[PDB]
Amino acid sequence: LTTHNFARKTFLKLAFCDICQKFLLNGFRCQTCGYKFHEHCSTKVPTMCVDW
Ligand SMILES: [Zn+2]
Ligand SMILES: [Zn+2]
């Protein structure tokens, strides 16, 4: 992986926050690995980008 990303935007499909446990809503998703998360996930999320 290389560098993460965080842009405020809404998803055009059902998503899910890997930091919390249920679907995800309009939050911040990385447009490189496909990350997504609410406000409880802005401290552990910024440090990863492993996408296959
Ligand atoms: Zn990323
Ligand atoms: Zn979350």
From Swiss-Prot:
Task: Please tell me where Zn(2+) 1 binds in this chain.
Answer: 4, 30, 33, 49
Instruction: Detail which positions bind Zn(2+) 2.
Output: 17, 20, 38, 41
Locations listed in the record: Cytoplasm; Cell membrane; Mitochondrion; Nucleus
Q: In which tissues is it expressed?
A: In skeletal muscle, isoform 1 is more abundant than isoform 2.
What are the residue ranges of zinc fingers typed Phorbol-ester/DAG-type? 3-49
How it assembles, according to the record, is:
Monomer. Homodimer. Heterodimerizes with BRAF and this heterodimer possesses a highly increased kinase activity compared to the respective homodimers or monomers. Heterodimerization is mitogen-regulated and enhanced by 14-3-3 proteins. MAPK1/ERK2 activation can induce a negative feedback that promotes the dissociation of the heterodimer. Forms a multiprotein complex with Ras (M-Ras/MRAS), SHOC2 and protein phosphatase 1 (PPP1CA, PPP1CB and PPP1CC). Interacts with LZTR1. Interacts with Ras proteins; the interaction is antagonized by RIN1. Weakly interacts with RIT1.
| Function text | Serine/threonine-protein kinase that acts as a regulatory link between the membrane-associated Ras GTPases and the MAPK/ERK cascade, and this critical regulatory link functions as a switch determining cell fate decisions including proliferation, differentiation, apoptosis, survival and oncogenic transformation. RAF1 activation initiates a mitogen-activated protein kinase (MAPK) cascade that comprises a sequential phosphorylation of the dual-specific MAPK kinases (MAP2K1/MEK1 and MAP2K2/MEK2) and the extracellular signal-regulated kinases (MAPK3/ERK1 and MAPK1/ERK2).
Q: Which family does it belong to?
A: Belongs to the protein kinase superfamily. TKL Ser/Thr protein kinase family. RAF subfamily.
Could you tell me what this protein is called?
RAF proto-oncogene serine/threonine-protein kinase
